[PDB]
Every structure is written in structure tokens, then in C-alpha cells.
Design an enzyme around this catalytic site. Structure first.
Site, PDB file in Angstrom:
ATOM      1  N   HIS A  72     103.711  38.639  -7.053  1.00  0.00           N
ATOM      2  CA  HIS A  72     102.893  38.988  -8.205  1.00  0.00           C
ATOM      3  C   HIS A  72     103.321  40.340  -8.776  1.00  0.00           C
ATOM      4  O   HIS A  72     103.465  41.324  -8.039  1.00  0.00           O
ATOM      5  CB  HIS A  72     101.416  39.029  -7.805  1.00  0.00           C
ATOM      6  CG  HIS A  72     100.816  37.679  -7.576  1.00  0.00           C
ATOM      7  ND1 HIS A  72      99.487  37.412  -7.817  1.00  0.00           N
ATOM      8  CD2 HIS A  72     101.361  36.517  -7.152  1.00  0.00           C
ATOM      9  CE1 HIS A  72      99.239  36.143  -7.553  1.00  0.00           C
ATOM     10  NE2 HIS A  72     100.357  35.576  -7.148  1.00  0.00           N
ATOM     11  N   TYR A 201      89.957  40.668 -10.844  1.00  0.00           N
ATOM     12  CA  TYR A 201      88.883  41.447 -10.221  1.00  0.00           C
ATOM     13  C   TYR A 201      87.884  41.619 -11.360  1.00  0.00           C
ATOM     14  O   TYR A 201      88.252  42.036 -12.456  1.00  0.00           O
ATOM     15  CB  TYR A 201      89.396  42.819  -9.781  1.00  0.00           C
ATOM     16  CG  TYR A 201      90.291  42.808  -8.560  1.00  0.00           C
ATOM     17  CD1 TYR A 201      91.630  42.443  -8.652  1.00  0.00           C
ATOM     18  CD2 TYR A 201      89.808  43.211  -7.322  1.00  0.00           C
ATOM     19  CE1 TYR A 201      92.463  42.470  -7.528  1.00  0.00           C
ATOM     20  CE2 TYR A 201      90.634  43.243  -6.192  1.00  0.00           C
ATOM     21  CZ  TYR A 201      91.957  42.877  -6.307  1.00  0.00           C
ATOM     22  OH  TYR A 201      92.774  42.900  -5.194  1.00  0.00           O
ATOM     23  N   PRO A 293      87.368  45.296   1.921  1.00  0.00           N
ATOM     24  CA  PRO A 293      88.349  44.335   1.394  1.00  0.00           C
ATOM     25  C   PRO A 293      88.889  44.569  -0.021  1.00  0.00           C
ATOM     26  O   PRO A 293      90.014  44.171  -0.321  1.00  0.00           O
ATOM     27  CB  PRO A 293      87.604  43.009   1.468  1.00  0.00           C
ATOM     28  CG  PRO A 293      86.601  43.220   2.569  1.00  0.00           C
ATOM     29  CD  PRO A 293      86.124  44.610   2.317  1.00  0.00           C
ATOM     30  N   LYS A 297      93.822  46.471   1.791  1.00  0.00           N
ATOM     31  CA  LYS A 297      94.568  47.377   2.667  1.00  0.00           C
ATOM     32  C   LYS A 297      94.521  47.111   4.172  1.00  0.00           C
ATOM     33  O   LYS A 297      95.427  47.526   4.897  1.00  0.00           O
ATOM     34  CB  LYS A 297      94.125  48.840   2.423  1.00  0.00           C
ATOM     35  CG  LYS A 297      94.576  49.503   1.115  1.00  0.00           C
ATOM     36  CD  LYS A 297      95.646  48.687   0.418  1.00  0.00           C
ATOM     37  CE  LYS A 297      96.474  49.514  -0.523  1.00  0.00           C
ATOM     38  NZ  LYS A 297      97.512  48.629  -1.119  1.00  0.00           N
ATOM     39  N   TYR A 385      98.014  50.493  -5.315  1.00  0.00           N
ATOM     40  CA  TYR A 385      97.878  49.065  -5.102  1.00  0.00           C
ATOM     41  C   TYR A 385      99.082  48.452  -4.445  1.00  0.00           C
ATOM     42  O   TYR A 385      98.912  47.723  -3.448  1.00  0.00           O
ATOM     43  CB  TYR A 385      97.547  48.353  -6.415  1.00  0.00           C
ATOM     44  CG  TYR A 385      97.032  46.957  -6.234  1.00  0.00           C
ATOM     45  CD1 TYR A 385      95.670  46.719  -6.052  1.00  0.00           C
ATOM     46  CD2 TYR A 385      97.909  45.864  -6.219  1.00  0.00           C
ATOM     47  CE1 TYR A 385      95.187  45.424  -5.858  1.00  0.00           C
ATOM     48  CE2 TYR A 385      97.436  44.557  -6.027  1.00  0.00           C
ATOM     49  CZ  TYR A 385      96.080  44.353  -5.850  1.00  0.00           C
ATOM     50  OH  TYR A 385      95.622  43.075  -5.672  1.00  0.00           O
TER      51      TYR A 385
HETATM   52  C1  FAD Z   1      87.314  38.915   3.605  1.00  0.00           C
HETATM   53  C2  FAD Z   1      88.469  39.785   4.020  1.00  0.00           C
HETATM   54  C3  FAD Z   1      89.458  39.961   3.138  1.00  0.00           C
HETATM   55  C4  FAD Z   1      90.557  40.745   3.446  1.00  0.00           C
HETATM   56  N1  FAD Z   1      91.520  40.889   2.545  1.00  0.00           N
HETATM   57  C5  FAD Z   1      92.643  41.511   2.862  1.00  0.00           C
HETATM   58  C6  FAD Z   1      93.898  41.432   1.970  1.00  0.00           C
HETATM   59  O1  FAD Z   1      93.967  40.809   0.895  1.00  0.00           O
HETATM   60  N2  FAD Z   1      94.988  42.203   2.435  1.00  0.00           N
HETATM   61  C7  FAD Z   1      94.877  43.047   3.544  1.00  0.00           C
HETATM   62  O2  FAD Z   1      95.740  43.842   3.870  1.00  0.00           O
HETATM   63  N3  FAD Z   1      93.718  43.049   4.331  1.00  0.00           N
HETATM   64  C8  FAD Z   1      92.690  42.251   4.088  1.00  0.00           C
HETATM   65  N4  FAD Z   1      91.659  42.151   4.993  1.00  0.00           N
HETATM   66  C9  FAD Z   1      91.736  42.574   6.484  1.00  0.00           C
HETATM   67  C10 FAD Z   1      92.443  42.013   7.659  1.00  0.00           C
HETATM   68  O3  FAD Z   1      91.907  40.688   7.751  1.00  0.00           O
HETATM   69  C11 FAD Z   1      92.325  42.822   8.952  1.00  0.00           C
HETATM   70  O4  FAD Z   1      92.541  44.224   8.701  1.00  0.00           O
HETATM   71  C12 FAD Z   1      93.324  42.361   9.991  1.00  0.00           C
HETATM   72  O5  FAD Z   1      92.831  41.144  10.519  1.00  0.00           O
HETATM   73  C13 FAD Z   1      93.368  43.228  11.185  1.00  0.00           C
HETATM   74  O6  FAD Z   1      94.291  42.736  12.121  1.00  0.00           O
HETATM   75  P1  FAD Z   1      94.201  43.225  13.643  1.00  0.00           P
HETATM   76  O7  FAD Z   1      95.297  42.588  14.383  1.00  0.00           O
HETATM   77  O8  FAD Z   1      94.127  44.695  13.729  1.00  0.00           O
HETATM   78  O9  FAD Z   1      92.839  42.532  14.153  1.00  0.00           O
HETATM   79  P2  FAD Z   1      92.121  41.086  14.192  1.00  0.00           P
HETATM   80  O10 FAD Z   1      92.521  40.091  13.155  1.00  0.00           O
HETATM   81  O11 FAD Z   1      90.669  41.358  14.357  1.00  0.00           O
HETATM   82  O12 FAD Z   1      92.603  40.561  15.628  1.00  0.00           O
HETATM   83  C14 FAD Z   1      92.293  41.271  16.808  1.00  0.00           C
HETATM   84  C15 FAD Z   1      92.497  40.354  18.031  1.00  0.00           C
HETATM   85  O13 FAD Z   1      91.808  41.000  19.097  1.00  0.00           O
HETATM   86  C16 FAD Z   1      91.271  40.039  19.994  1.00  0.00           C
HETATM   87  N5  FAD Z   1      90.292  40.616  20.912  1.00  0.00           N
HETATM   88  C17 FAD Z   1      89.053  41.154  20.636  1.00  0.00           C
HETATM   89  N6  FAD Z   1      88.463  41.676  21.686  1.00  0.00           N
HETATM   90  C18 FAD Z   1      89.351  41.379  22.733  1.00  0.00           C
HETATM   91  C19 FAD Z   1      89.367  41.762  24.051  1.00  0.00           C
HETATM   92  N7  FAD Z   1      88.340  42.423  24.574  1.00  0.00           N
HETATM   93  N8  FAD Z   1      90.457  41.426  24.770  1.00  0.00           N
HETATM   94  C20 FAD Z   1      91.377  40.630  24.231  1.00  0.00           C
HETATM   95  N9  FAD Z   1      91.477  40.194  22.990  1.00  0.00           N
HETATM   96  C21 FAD Z   1      90.438  40.684  22.277  1.00  0.00           C
HETATM   97  C22 FAD Z   1      90.531  39.234  18.992  1.00  0.00           C
HETATM   98  O14 FAD Z   1      90.020  37.961  19.506  1.00  0.00           O
HETATM   99  C23 FAD Z   1      91.572  39.118  17.905  1.00  0.00           C
HETATM  100  O15 FAD Z   1      92.302  37.910  18.125  1.00  0.00           O
HETATM  101  C24 FAD Z   1      90.616  41.362   4.715  1.00  0.00           C
HETATM  102  C25 FAD Z   1      89.591  41.142   5.645  1.00  0.00           C
HETATM  103  C26 FAD Z   1      88.571  40.374   5.346  1.00  0.00           C
HETATM  104  C27 FAD Z   1      87.551  40.230   6.426  1.00  0.00           C
HETATM  105  N1  PAB Z   2      91.269  42.613  -2.539  1.00  0.00           N
HETATM  106  C1  PAB Z   2      91.524  41.362  -2.117  1.00  0.00           C
HETATM  107  C2  PAB Z   2      92.499  40.577  -2.764  1.00  0.00           C
HETATM  108  C3  PAB Z   2      92.746  39.273  -2.365  1.00  0.00           C
HETATM  109  C4  PAB Z   2      92.044  38.703  -1.287  1.00  0.00           C
HETATM  110  C5  PAB Z   2      92.279  37.346  -0.890  1.00  0.00           C
HETATM  111  O1  PAB Z   2      93.135  36.663  -1.488  1.00  0.00           O
HETATM  112  O2  PAB Z   2      91.639  36.890   0.077  1.00  0.00           O
HETATM  113  C6  PAB Z   2      91.075  39.506  -0.648  1.00  0.00           C
HETATM  114  C7  PAB Z   2      90.818  40.809  -1.039  1.00  0.00           C
END
Ligand code: FAD
Ligand code: PAB
Ligand code: FAD
Ligand code: PAB
Lengths: 391, 391
Positions: A72, A201, A293, A297, A385
Site C-alpha cells: 500500500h 480511518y 491498535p 505498531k 506511519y
Molecule cells: C485488534 C488488534 C489489532 C492490531 N493491529 C495491529 C496492526 O495492524 N499492526 C501491528 O503491528 N500490530 C497490531 N496489533 C498487535 C499485535 O497483535 C501484537 O503486538 C503482537 O501479537 C504481539 O506479539 P507477541 O509475540 O509479543 O505476543 P502474542 O501474540 O501475545 O504471543 C505471546 C505468546 O505467549 C504465550 N504465553 C503466554 N503466557 C505464557 C506462559 N506463561 N508460558 C508460555 N507461553 C505463554 C501466549 O500463549 C502467546 O502464544 C494489533 C492487536 C490487536 C489486538
Molecule cells: N491500525 C490498524 C490498521 C489495520 C488493522 C487491521 O487490518 O487489522 C488494524 C489496526
């Protein structure tokens, strides 16, 4: 058992760190509390920075992304009667963002790891970290009903917001900064064509709405809702009627609706912990910080932490420069805070806040009018962004 | 008596409007509640936009300014250990700002008017506006103990925040937006050389401080203080000790202190009224809007209102296009809101607020670090500071 780097959590942070380390010859073991398909059921992220895209290519897992991800070059912001496009590519100096689902990224890494033969223990229950400050820390977990011990040099806590890692650092050593927003995002995933070739947005008097996508025949939509709402009250019909109500007339009439594959409410929050390490334990991703969200980031910040952690461990292992690992938090916090600021700004200009006086409403509208109408303003949105450079 | 345009208030707004009108052949009468030297005792403003500078030149009163005003090409912001210069001239596309006191501007206009022979009634007491919506509005006032009546076509309310003009429009017709800040500025004027050839805005843990000037041997300083302070508690010694405490060590040691010529506390506030007119009455300057001193916009916004009012009255009088006057508020409010936004932003990033949580402190610091370290960020500060274009 014994390994060099024990990784808690098999989300994208852990798997990405694990793949990078494995490729470089540094043996690692991943411990996940849940099952593979549980992890694969989380929808989450859709937008990735170019830096994360290059990190995936470097981890050698970019084939499918390179084929299915969408590049994009602009994003749209709609507010009070108008729709404005931000040409990210020219305003950021040629940079762009890629739309590729987090489920996909996770899937690709899981396959990559499964193939390499690297150790991964799913359903590892009761994980506990020990001797974080000694020369030989270790992790203990229960597989079925047997508690095993894993010996290592370092531990990477990539276990998300509710993981055991952050809880394992003496409360007195960490300083927390947190902001909880009075609303959440109700998202809906449908097998319908997206309403635009670029994200929209929208700031509307009824609240925020976001038009995203996963591919040409799969869309992801969101609407701001009170923290008191339960997803069971929001039928598919209701969601579509509400989304439509918040979009430009011309956008709503092009909208192709359909049954949801997934529906859920994610609450908004800002959270940073300082420092991000303790002895031989380093936190990465959601284990160390949470961003609303709105600025996309979260996953992207997790990728830059991992990139830093990986490169400092490389020097420590192959070059014997273990002292560099003390710099982990200083390096990471710089990018984290800048990203937290952008995410907070986006959140405050696009959302409708409760109990807002006439003055602050007017300032919110003017912030949009100024940043979206000024060459210098558009550029600040654009570079933030697309992602600020990795240090 | 009878005139074409009656002007309430002989502050810079009124005198400037009056001079412009007079030069164009449109007879005007100014009514001031106080005496000439009372008006001339107000210190106030020090920074002027280029647009105001050109407006003064057009009103034909720029000789002394052109000789005594100082042209500044950059400003400095000091925060948490550092000092950063914003090169306004290159970041704004060659624009700058001029340091010339408001007392001087007023003095120059008073002389100019006194010489032209245009009517000015000082000590006009009990001013009242009548028939604002008829074809023939009029003003009544008391000179000594005689109430005189002044007939006119239009009335320009340039009477400041506490003037009678705004009060004369039916409350139900206006919509007010106001924000009161929990602190004021304690200013001090001294006949000492300024500490820098450019202004220094400083964010310090003890609160805000500002190093300004009026000339090479006259300085103007400010420090943020609680609204509960009375200037009689702040001796000269105390002020200097406090100012010094809030500045960079290297700046404080170059500081040349001395006895004050003037000392006063101005409270901070944001205030806008919509619309800015009613029938044959048009509000200008502080009569219509108030901005916190931080962005140096007050007098500058008054100048742009006056510029708009003057040019619409010219068309109405000489070209008979009286319908254009309906556009007054729409034109002015656009610039006003943008300036209010900048003034609010500056106020929030440079001041210490009471009851601020750790998160918001961190965001305030990061806002500075981002805007002061990004080419696109510096540019947004610069163009706003030098002044956004007149429409
Ligand atoms: C609605 C939404 C929209 C988002 N949009 C965006 C986007 O467009 N772009 C972007 O950059 N970010 C976005 N984010 C965020 C992104 O989803 C998270 O920042 C990312 O998942 C973090 O990854 P992580 O590996 O740190 O953790 P997680 O995905 O939380 O994974 C952590 C792992 O830890 C495991 N765990 C937990 N406790 C234990 C334990 N005690 N022992 C062993 N395993 C354990 C969990 O089961 C999990 O599998 C969005 C988030 C949401 C919720
Ligand atoms: N800022 C955002 C942009 C896109 C998405 C998404 O596609 O899920 C989520 C958050
Ligand atoms: C500490 C401080 C610092 C500032 N710094 C800056 C700066 O650097 N640059 C900048 O642009 N702005 C600055 N400002 C603001 C600026 O001083 C004002 O915006 C400007 O004075 C407004 O001019 P005005 O003509 O609208 O009103 P005023 O200066 O208030 O004059 C209005 C006139 O109305 C007269 N009047 C009142 N009631 C009546 C009545 N009933 N009938 C007749 N006459 C009446 C008053 O006596 C007065 O003479 C600063 C202000 C302060 C207080
Ligand atoms: N922002 C401001 C800059 C300068 C002055 C002043 O010189 O009085 C006041 C406010």
C-alpha cells in the site's frame, strides 16, 4: 535438557527470534502454553512496516508474503464531511507498508521452524523462571504431569501482556507507565471484497470506524464501542448497519457485506515498562509494551525489539562481546516511546471521547484539518506511519 | 455627531483599523474608556509575524519599527538537559519574525492618528451600542457628565476581553469555547541586556521559563507560577533566583540581572466566540478570541482580523459590495482556530501541569524529542510560528 537461549511464547515475537537465532547457529528452545491451532486462531494485526518485511526476508520466510502480501502506497482519513488521502510513498521518501495478516506470518514461521527441526514445546504448563541473575538460569515446566528443567544461558520473554516473564522481575526494579482508554474496538472478519484498495480511518460523531482488508476477497472492519459492550449483543446485521452509519455515503453504498468468520472486542491500552531486562532475562514485544491498535505498531515494535535482541546475542555468542547486552533496553526504549507517542496521537484524533467539552472537540477537529492540509503535517504522519528507522 | 465606522477601543486593533480606514478615505471615530498613558502602560506583546509587519507598513507607520525592531531567524527550546534551535527562516521557506514591543506599536499608531486629525475620544465612559440590526446603529457615551450620541453605519468592537461589544450581542446568538489553564505567567521587564540574541523557551521540572527581549539593553523574562501567587510575594531577587534555577547552567551564568521596571502576572486562557459579528457590529482581536501567550499569537490574530475587516469595508464603501461583510466570521475563524491549536500545543508541551501521571509526563517529553528531532516536525513548528498565510 539444555539449550543456549530459552524462548517463552510462540507468538510472532518468539518464532521470529527463534528463526533468526537458529539460522545463525544459536540453538534455541521455544515453550508455548497453548496449542498450535490456538495460536493460529488469533486474528490481530494486518499492517506491517518495511523493516518487519525485511526482517522476515532475512529470517528466510518471505516467499508467501512476497506473493500474497499487498503493498500500500497511501491511506485515507475521513472526517467531518471529507476524505483525505495520505500518499505515504512520496511523503515518506519512497517508503510503503504491507498488508499481510498476523495469522499468516505466524503460520509461515511455524512451518519454517517445524521444517528446521528446532525444538518447540507446546502445552508447556506452569512455566517458571529461575536464577535470572546467576551465570546459569533455568526454566521449569510441566509436560503432562512431569516437571522438566531446561538449562540455558539467556531467556527471552516473548510471552505477551499476560506472560510469566514480566511478573518474574522484582516489582521494585521496574517502572510502569500505563493509560487505559474508555473504549474498545469491535472487529469483524468477513470473506467479502474490501470497500477500498487502501485503508480508511474514519472519525465520525458516532465514533471511530476502520476499513481494512486481508486480501482481495477478505476484509477486516472495526468500530469503536464502549467497554461495557459484549460481542453477543452485536449481531452481524447490527455491525453492518453501524459501520455504514459511520462512513462517507459514497463508501457505505459500495460496501459488500456478509457473514462474519470472526468477531471480537479488543480494549485499548498504552503500557511501557522500564527497563526491559533483568539479569539474563530480556522482554520482547507485548511482554514489555502495549500500544493502542490505531497506529498499527504492536507487532511492528515486537519485530524491532527482536531485531535488536537477535543482533546483540549474535555479537555475544560469535564475537564474545556479552557486554553489549546491557544496552538492550536503551536501544529499544527509544523506538518504543516514539511509537507510543504516534499511537496515542492517532488514537486521540480519530476517536470520540466521553465527556469532551466544546473546546476540546474543536481542537480535535482542527488537529485533523491542520495535519491533513499541511505539507509538513502530512509528512509527520507519513514517516511515523511507514515506520521510523531502526537504530 | 456622525461618522462612517465607530471603533470601540484604542488598543492596537482599533488604532490599526482606524489608521487603515483613514488612509483609504473612510472616516472613523475611536472611543477609548481610559487615558492615552494608561493604554501606553500595558507591556504585553513582543513578537510580531511578517504579515503584521507588512500591515504596519501599509498603514504607513513603519519608520521606527524598521529602525528599532529586531529580525529573528531562529528560536531555541530547552528541555531535559538540552537546548535546540529552530531555524525558522530555512524551515519556513525564508520567513522570520520581528521583535518590537506592543507599547511601541501602540505609540507609533497614536502619533500617526494624532497627526492625521482623525477623531479619538479618550475617557469615553459608559459606552453603549444601539440598533445593531437596523440600517442606522448608534453609540452613546458620557464625556464628563454629558451623554453624547454618535451615529454611524458600522461598529467595530476592538475593546478587548472585557469590552462592551461582545456583551452587546444576544447571548443566544453566540457559541463560546473556553479553556482556563491552572497557571499564569509572572513577567518581569528590566533594563538589562538580553541573555541571548534569540528567544529561549524552556521546559523545566520546576515549570516554564521564557527569555525574551525588547532591544539590546532591555529584556523581558517570564516564569510559570500558580494562579494563587500575588506579585507582591515575588521580589526581584526571588524572581532572578527562580529564573536561574529553570535555565541551562550555561545560560543562567551569562544572565545579567537588574531591578524591574515592570512586574505582573498574566493568567493563561483559550477563548473563541462564534460567530464574530451581529448585524452592523463586527468584533476584532481580544473582543472575539483569547490565546495563551505561549505561541505569541494574540496581537498577530488581532492584526489579521483587522486586515480582513478593513478590506471587506473597503469593498463595501468604495465598490458598494456590502454583501461581502457577511463573510467576515467565516474568513477569520479559519485562521483563529489554527492559531488556537498551535498556542494550545505550545502551552501543553512547555508547561508543567499539576496532577500529571507518569505516562503523560513521558508523552510530553517524547513530543518534544520527536518534533525537535524530525525535519518534518521542525517544519510544523516553524511555519506555525512564523505565521500561517492570511487568506
Ligand atoms: C485488534 C488488534 C489489532 C492490531 N493491529 C495491529 C496492526 O495492524 N499492526 C501491528 O503491528 N500490530 C497490531 N496489533 C498487535 C499485535 O497483535 C501484537 O503486538 C503482537 O501479537 C504481539 O506479539 P507477541 O509475540 O509479543 O505476543 P502474542 O501474540 O501475545 O504471543 C505471546 C505468546 O505467549 C504465550 N504465553 C503466554 N503466557 C505464557 C506462559 N506463561 N508460558 C508460555 N507461553 C505463554 C501466549 O500463549 C502467546 O502464544 C494489533 C492487536 C490487536 C489486538
Ligand atoms: N491500525 C490498524 C490498521 C489495520 C488493522 C487491521 O487490518 O487489522 C488494524 C489496526
Ligand atoms: C503577557 C502577554 C504576552 C503576550 N505576548 C504576545 C506576543 O509576543 N505576540 C502576540 O501576538 N501577542 C501577545 N499577547 C497578546 C496581546 O497583548 C493582545 O492580544 C492584544 O493586546 C489585543 O489587542 P486588542 O486591541 O484586541 O485589545 P487590548 O490591548 O485589550 O485593547 C482594547 C482596548 O479596549 C478598551 N476598552 C475596554 N472596554 C472599553 C469600553 N467599554 N469602551 C471603550 N474602550 C474600552 C480598553 O481600555 C483597551 O484600550 C500577549 C499578551 C499578554 C497578556
Ligand atoms: N511567546 C511569547 C514570546 C515573547 C513574548 C514577549 O517578548 O513578551 C511573550 C510571549
Amino acid at each position: 535438557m539444555k539449550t543456549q537461549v530459552a524462548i517463552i511464547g510462540a507468538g510472532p515475537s518468539g518464532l521470529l527470534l527463534g528463526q533468526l537465532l537458529h539460522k545463525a547457529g544459536i540453538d534455541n528452545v521455544i515453550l508455548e502454553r497453548q496449542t498450535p491451532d490456538y495460536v493460529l486462531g488469533r486474528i490481530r494485526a494486518g499492517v506491517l512496516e518495511q523493516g518487519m518485511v525485511d526482517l522476515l526476508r532475512e529470517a528466510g520466510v518471505d516467499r508467501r508474503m512476497a506473493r500474497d502480501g499487498l503493498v500500500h502506497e497511501g491511506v485515507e482519513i475521513a472526517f467531518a464531511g471529507q476524505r483525505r488521502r495520505i500518499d505515504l510513498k512520496r511523503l515518506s521518501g519512497g517508503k510503503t507498508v504491507t498488508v499481510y495478516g498476523q495469522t499468516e506470518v505466524t503460520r509461515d514461521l511455524m512451518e519454517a521452524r517445524e521444517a528446521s527441526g528446532a525444538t518447540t514445546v507446546y502445552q508447556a504448563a506452569e512455566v517458571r523462571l529461575h536464577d535470572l541473575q546467576g551465570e546459569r538460569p533455568y526454566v521449569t515446566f510441566e509436560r503432562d504431569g512431569e516437571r522438566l528443567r531446561l538449562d540455558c544461558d539467556y531467556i527471552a520473554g516473548c510471552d505477551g501482556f499476560h506472560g510469566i516473564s514480566r511478573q518474574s522481575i522484582p516489582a521494585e526494579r521496574l517502572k510502569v507507565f500505563e493509560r487505559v482508554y474508555p473504549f474498545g474496538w469491535l472487529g469483524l472478519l468477513a470473506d467479502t471484497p474490501p470497500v477500498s484498495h487502501e485503508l480508511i480511518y474514519a472519525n465520525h460523531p458516532r465514533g471511530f470506524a476502520l476499513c481494512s482488508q486481508r486480501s482481495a476477497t477478505r476484509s477486516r472492519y472495526y468500530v469503536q464501542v464502549p467497554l461495557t459492550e459484549k460481542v453477543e449483543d452485536w449481531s452481524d446485521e447490527r455491525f453492518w448497519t453501524e459501520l455504514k452509519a459511520r462512513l462517507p455515503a459514497e463508501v457505505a453504498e459500495k460496501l459488500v457485506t456478509g457473514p462474519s468468520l470472526e468477531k471480537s472486542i479488543a480494549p485499548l491500552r498504552s503500557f511501557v515498562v522500564e527497563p526491559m531486562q533483568h539479569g539474563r532475562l530480556f522482554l520482547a514485544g507485548d511482554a514489555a509494551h502495549i500500544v493502542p491498535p490505531t497506529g498499527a505498531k504492536g507487532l511492528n515494535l515486537a519485530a524491532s525489539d527482536v531485531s535488536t535482541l537477535y543482533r546483540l546475542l549474535l555479537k555475544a555468542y560469535r564475537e564474545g562481546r556479552g557486554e553489549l547486552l546491557e544496552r538492550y533496553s536503551a536501544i529499544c526504549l527509544r523506538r518504543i516511546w516514539k511509537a507510543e507517542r504516534f499511537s496515542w496521537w492517532m488514537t486521540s484524533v480519530l476517536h470520540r471521547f466521553p465527556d469532551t467539552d466544546a473546546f476540546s472537540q474543536r481542537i480535535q477537529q482542527t488537529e485533523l484539518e491542520y495535519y491533513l492540509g499541511s505539507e509538513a503535517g502530512l509528512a509527520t504522519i507519513a514517516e511515523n506511519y511507514v515506520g521510523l528507522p531502526y537504530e
